[PDB]
């Protein structure tokens, strides 16, 4: 069945079919274009007319142009041959290495795993970062979110997480670059080629790349995350493997939905967002889950517009995450990198039964002293430090030392600050923070804990400025 284009408004194209209306979420190929413009059916407007969302630019589309129905949703090449290859929204290899010769194809749109297929196993994914490991530890096979504003450290943190886990990860990995800088994608591709995680010679590559960037039209940016998720789903289900799914940035999916919903003819929700803001987000997110077949340990970077965590897009996504890491611009202003907020990042495995009694006690003590310092900050700000009690002064000093000690250099950030990246183990940072809380290091200066790893580095830095 072939239809004719009737309306071309932005990325939304309306097609009228003489017979055989394609169902919703069905790919339609536009005939007469040098490239491959494929439309995804979104609505049946009646009068044998469908409304579609284009996966590419709609320039040059003429009303009445012939478009052929594919008869199936957008399908992508999936399998072991996708490892070490770059794909776009519609599964076209954009790494100019030839076609992706996979034996099977998978539909972009699928149903989330059922309730019984869900898994409840919870472990700890030690990432080598003091703030993450101590306060908000990550769980293997659990959704992880990296909240933050503009230029606070989301990309650097996700690259550090990749460098720490994926290289040492036994299973495969999938990276889905949604609405991010294309030069960042090129840098990641070349870094993975150099590190050997992607090999251009033999089939030993471990990570598959999917890239729909900010240059893409809103239709493409709203489905590339689904492409990466589909690849991860295949690797999880049909092979029973442990897979890491890195998404950056996942907010652009919601932003693309908001861009297309204005043209789709929907009454806008709060802050001009689409009314179907939570439904589509839930449909996309609940597919990124650890079933009984396999585990998807997903790390997702979530952009926070105008540094407003109450914005609907970064607010509705909290319920979809096990471990939450909320970066803050105010902390980054103080030079504490990473900019993780210790009083806003939370984890689900932060429980004495799972993480251990000592770990939970240390984390809770650190959070308590930080909250006490933050409560005292107003009096310190107005009156001065000299007006506090001796115990209050001690708490302020210890909390400032803890804030300095949370900062940690990153290997990916070595080219930036010149400080060698440090990968502390869980026990070492636990011991260091326990010692700081106890008071063994109440004589060292505050700067002795800045941009250091283990507490031994702090004590070996304190005596340098003797």
């Amino acid at each position: 069945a072939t239809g004719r284009i009737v309306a071309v408004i932005g990325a939304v194209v309306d097609v009228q079919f003489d017979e055989g209306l394609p169902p919703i979420l069905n790919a339609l190929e536009v005939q007469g274009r040098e490239t491959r413009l494929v439309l995804e059916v979104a609505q049946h407007l009646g009068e044998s007319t469908v409304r579609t969302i284009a996966m590419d630019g709609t320039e040059g589309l003429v009303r009445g142009q012939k478009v052929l129905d594919s008869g199936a949703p957008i399908k992508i090449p999936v399998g072991p041959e996708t490892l070490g290859r770059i794909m776009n929204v519609i599964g076209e290899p954009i790494d100019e290495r030839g076609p992706i010769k996979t034996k099977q194809f998978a539909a972009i749109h699928a149903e989330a795993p059922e309730f019984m297929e869900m898994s409840v196993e919870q472990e700890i994914l030690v990432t080598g970062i003091k703030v993450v490991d101590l306060l908000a530890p990550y769980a293997k096979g659990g959704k992880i979110g990296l909240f933050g504003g503009a230029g606070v450290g989301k990309t650097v943190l996700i690259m550090e997480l990749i460098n720490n886990v994926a290289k040492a990860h036994g299973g495969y990995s999938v990276f889905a670059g949604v609405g991010e800088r294309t030069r960042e994608g090129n840098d990641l591709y070349h870094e993975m080629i150099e590190s050997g995680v992607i090999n251009l010679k033999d089939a030993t590559s471990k990570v598959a790349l999917v890239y729909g960037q900010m240059n893409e039209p809103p239709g493409a940016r709203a489905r590339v995350a689904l492409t990466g998720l589909t690849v991860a789903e295949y690797f999880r289900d049909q092979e029973g493997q442990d897979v890491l799914l890195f998404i950056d940035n996942i907010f652009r999916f919601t932003q693309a939905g908001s861009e297309v919903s204005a043209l789709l003819g929907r009454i806008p929700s709060a802050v001009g967002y689409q009314p179907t803001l939570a439904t589509d987000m839930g449909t996309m997110q609940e597919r990124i889950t650890t079933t009984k077949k396999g585990s998807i340990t997903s790390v997702q970077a979530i952009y926070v517009p105008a540094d407003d965590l109450t914005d609907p897009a970064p607010a509705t996504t909290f319920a979809h995450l096990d471990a939450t890491t909320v970066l803050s611009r105010a902390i980054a202003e103080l030079g504490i990198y990473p900019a993780v907020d210790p009083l806003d990042s939370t984890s689900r495995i932060m429980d004495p039964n799972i993480v251990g009694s000592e770990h939970y006690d240390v984390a809770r003590g650190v959070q308590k002293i930080l909250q006490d310092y933050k409560s005292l900050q107003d009096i310190i700000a107005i009156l001065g430090m000299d007006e506090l009690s001796e115990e209050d002064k001690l708490t302020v000093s210890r909390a400032r030392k803890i804030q300095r000690f949370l900062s940690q250099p990153f290997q990916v950030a070595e080219v930036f600050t010149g400080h060698l990246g440090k990968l502390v183990p869980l026990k070492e940072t636990i011991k260091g923070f326990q010692q700081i809380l106890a008071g063994e290091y109440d004589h060292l200066p505050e700067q002795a804990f800045y941009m250091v790893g283990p507490i031994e580095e702090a004590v070996a830095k304190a005596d340098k400025l003797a």
Binding site: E114, F115, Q122, A270, P275, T276, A278, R364
Partner: protein
Amino acid sequence: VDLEETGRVLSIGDGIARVHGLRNVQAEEMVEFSSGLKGMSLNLEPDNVGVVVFGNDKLIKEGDIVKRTGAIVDVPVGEELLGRVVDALGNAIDGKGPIGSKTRRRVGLKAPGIIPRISVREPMQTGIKAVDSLVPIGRGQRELIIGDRQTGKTSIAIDTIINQKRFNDGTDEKKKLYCIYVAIGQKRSTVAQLVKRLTDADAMKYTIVVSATASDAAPLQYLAPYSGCSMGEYFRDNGKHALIIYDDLSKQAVAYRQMSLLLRRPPGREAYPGDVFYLHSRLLERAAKMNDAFGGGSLTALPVIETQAGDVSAYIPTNVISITDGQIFLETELFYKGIRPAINVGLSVSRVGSAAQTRAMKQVAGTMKLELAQYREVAAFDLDAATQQLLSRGVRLTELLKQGQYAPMAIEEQVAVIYAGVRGYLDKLEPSKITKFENAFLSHVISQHQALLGKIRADGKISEETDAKLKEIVTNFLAGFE
């Protein structure tokens, strides 16, 4: 083709299917699509019917035959649903087989009137020292567990679920509380973890988990609270006591907003429909305490509201606060300061109050409440007898209120602990060791002095002999421990 008992889809988009025909379809009547998907006719427009689809709309296309069912949307109800995890429409999703319910009940039934109700008398024990002491919850009352994300609302709900086990496996029929949990907007992983927790505590055998997750369509998430409300109403009208938890009504409001906006209904404040207040009011008003003329049953409600950055003055939180009888304010500042559960007893209130509370607990809780109020008056920043003693006593009581997760306490044990704290048996110990002392005292009393706890539980109040014996044992244990 018939156009009175059936019709065709004019246009299907975003889960809304305009239908031509259905001239005899009723308002809010459940309709059935060709592909097997079910619907609900909300907009009866002059030339079309706006049907919300209970599921994915990819299987619905223009020209499909829509058929009536002849009955307003209703949910399978009964006691067979105990131990079963169902969806908004009542279908079993735990793979345990079909539900054997023999009766059905509408999801939009009217709330009981003035006459059928009676005063809230029986206490609703939650197992939380703070709730059972300073913010008591009666049976038939509706308390709002309000707070921000990751503050402990679901923890309070599940602890209340677990605490009922002691009554449910007991003998008397007047203390059994058949819990119901409604999951709105949560991901399936969280619901699976919750049901695993319930099974681990053996709380599933008397609870019903109605889940309308985020992947489920907006109509399902909008209908889920009413389904659980009907399931609770079944117990309420048959002389049995039930507990219903809506977690959380904010996501139900979001789902209803999506449904209304997709139905071309005009937006209101914060894009929400005009009748968001009605949406919850017609739901929470169905939580009542029937008198003896109607079986004497009850339905305690525990709605949960998520507030952004503690903005309790927002639209939906204010509506739900105005609807409910009491609020349990959970504050992140108290959460991080080590106070867990982070129940802000300063603002947390209970309209029923002392009306539904055991006598001994009330007797000791009056003193505890007065002392904590004075401490809060003198908390922030030098009479050792007046201020410093009061400050120390308040710190001891605050450390007493702290309780671990998934460990609800028996009411008599709570009474004993609060008595120990109130009568100056912990002022000598360090504040840090209070929790350790409480655990050890719990073990000792539950081991050796079970007779005293049985006497307290049976009497319902602490008498002179009981008070003297409790003083004796607490003094002996204080001497032994320190």
